Amino acid sequence: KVLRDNIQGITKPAIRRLARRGGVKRISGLIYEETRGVLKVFLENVIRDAVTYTEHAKRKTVTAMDVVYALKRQGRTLYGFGG
């Protein structure tokens, strides 16, 4: 009845360490898939904004500056950066 999911990519112990870095010592089975999912969604959000800036500048390369402008629009994570 219990099953082990496959993945390519982000390993269980990295996720355990991220949780631990937040003070969380014990996480359930769904927390792994959730953490990968949340990570992917956050990255999609940032990259969607970043590429909007890139296309506005008429470039094909997403620059670190594009990513900064995007990140500032994602709420508290980078709040206050640069001033």
Partner: protein, 205 residues
């Protein structure tokens, strides 16, 4: 006091590593490169590790500590209870060095209990619990703040060092601003959606 010549040699090497790190930071990676174990991103990471090792060796040679002025090196005081021993144990708990220092309620409560039993303060269980809860709340605020500042004070590289929010292209192009506003509505929904999706899967199990 270390050898002046060797210090100068190692500092030259350090500057070389920095120049190469900057070069790699500016490389533009296509999709196949992002799939490559030897991409500029990975080379850069290896080189940073090499550089930090060399920096540590230079600290050794100059008889210095390994500190770099990180915000997380700043001590967070706690004097929130009426028992200086409890305050001591909590303050020690939250100032353990490194990037992983963040206790849970259990850690704080354990610190309060241990300080109480060690110094025979004779505090009853519910007083200890309330003390731990108030302490946990206070230190949680301070830890999150210290991490936030460490992040924003140490973010990016030379390519983002001239960033300032008043230069945001969106401020002078309403078409761009409109698109970003649309993006933001979508982003918030997507995040809610994933959080809620796994909550729902949990409530199906």
């Amino acid at each position: 006091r270390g050898s002046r010549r060797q210090i100068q040699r190692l500092e030259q090497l350090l500057a070389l590593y920095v120049a190469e790190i900057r070069r790699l930071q500016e490389k533009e990676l296509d999709l196949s490169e992002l799939d490559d174990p030897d991409s500029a991103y990975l080379q850069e990471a290896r080189l940073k590790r090499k550089l930090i090792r060399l920096f540590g060796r230079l600290c050794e040679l100059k008889d210095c500590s390994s500190l770099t002025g990180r915000v997380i090196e700043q001590r967070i005081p706690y004097r929130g209870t009426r028992y200086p021993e409890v305050n001591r144990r909590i303050e020690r708990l939250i100032n353990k060095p490194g990037p992983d220092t963040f206790p849970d309620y259990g850690d704080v409560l354990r610190a309060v209990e241990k300080a109480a039993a060690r110094h025979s303060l004779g505090l009853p269980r519910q007083q200890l619990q309330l003390m731990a809860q108030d302490a946990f709340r206070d230190v949680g605020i301070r830890l999150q703040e210290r991490r936030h500042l460490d992040l924003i004070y140490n973010f990016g590289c030379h390519l983002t060092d001239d960033y300032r929010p008043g230069v945001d292209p969106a401020l002078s192009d309403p078409v761009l601003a409109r698109r970003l506003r649309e993006n933001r509505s979508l982003a918030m929904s997507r995040l809610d959606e994933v959080i809620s999706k796994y909550a729902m899967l949990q409530d199906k199990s």
